């Protein structure tokens, strides 16, 4: 496709300029071309939306932290509650765009277990971003949808991936975070992170010389989440 190369050009342009809103619309159009994404175009899509939703996430937590330190009788509370809901609506729509991209294009045209693990991990990720702010009956179902995608990706990666690959290590770290932040279960969060780390150390001979940098960083991230949580 003619514009497919131009869309990867503008995407790389906007990433270097830290214009992730523009970068995410190009990677969205590319995904809407039906064709299964290559490894480069695949990670360009997540980098874009991780910054787009990451700006809303970090802003939401700053606003929600102020609201919890605000007495239920302050006049500024309804304004803080109104501004929080404004951030949530943008945040909710971002994950909505990502999730319908996942189910109508990405997970549908996978045809190999690596991309299934990658895209199912993204499903668990962005449902976790929704569960971070959901409340009521909404919360429990987004939680079950997040755990649903993580467990499937965790089962496929456990039987088709080696514990040293960054994707299995990355999913193990995000799943371990889900068990700590969402389910509020630190004991199982550490054990999931510990065995993923220990299985990667054991099969250190199965690590490909290309994805060495990524795996060394992700294994360190697991050990600090470990070191932090067990105290």
């Amino acid at each position: 496709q003619g514009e497919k190369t131009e869309l990867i050009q503008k995407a790389k342009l906007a990433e270097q300029a830290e214009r992730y809103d523009d970068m995410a619309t190009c990677m969205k159009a590319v995904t809407e071309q039906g064709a299964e994404l290559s490894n480069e175009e695949r990670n360009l899509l997540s980098v874009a939306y991780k910054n787009v939703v990451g700006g809303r996430r970090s802003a939401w937590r700053v606003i929600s932290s102020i609201e919890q330190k605000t007495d239920t009788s302050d006049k500024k509370l309804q304004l803080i509650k109104d501004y929080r809901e404004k951030v949530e609506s943008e945040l909710r729509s971002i994950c909505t765009t990502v999730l319908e991209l996942l189910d109508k294009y990405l997970i549908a045209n996978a045809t190999n277990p690596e991309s299934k693990v990658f895209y199912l991990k993204m499903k668990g990720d962005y449902f976790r971003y929704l569960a971070e702010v959901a409340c009521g009956d909404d919360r429990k179902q987004t939680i079950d949808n997040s755990q649903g995608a993580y467990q499937e990706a965790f089962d496929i990666s456990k039987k088709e991936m080696q514990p040293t690959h960054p994707i299995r290590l990355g999913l193990a770290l995000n799943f371990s975070v889900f068990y700590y932040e969402i389910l509020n279960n630190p004991e199982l969060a550490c054990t999931l992170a510990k065995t993923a780390f220990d299985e990667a150390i054991a099969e250190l001979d199965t690590l490909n010389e290309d994805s060495y940098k990524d795996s060394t960083l992700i294994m360190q991230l697991l050990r600090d989440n470990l070191t932090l949580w067990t105290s």
Binding site: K50, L173, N225, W229
Partner: peptide, 5 residues
């Protein structure tokens, strides 16, 4: 604390 990036 830290998620993947």
């Amino acid at each position: 604390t830290q998620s993947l990036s």
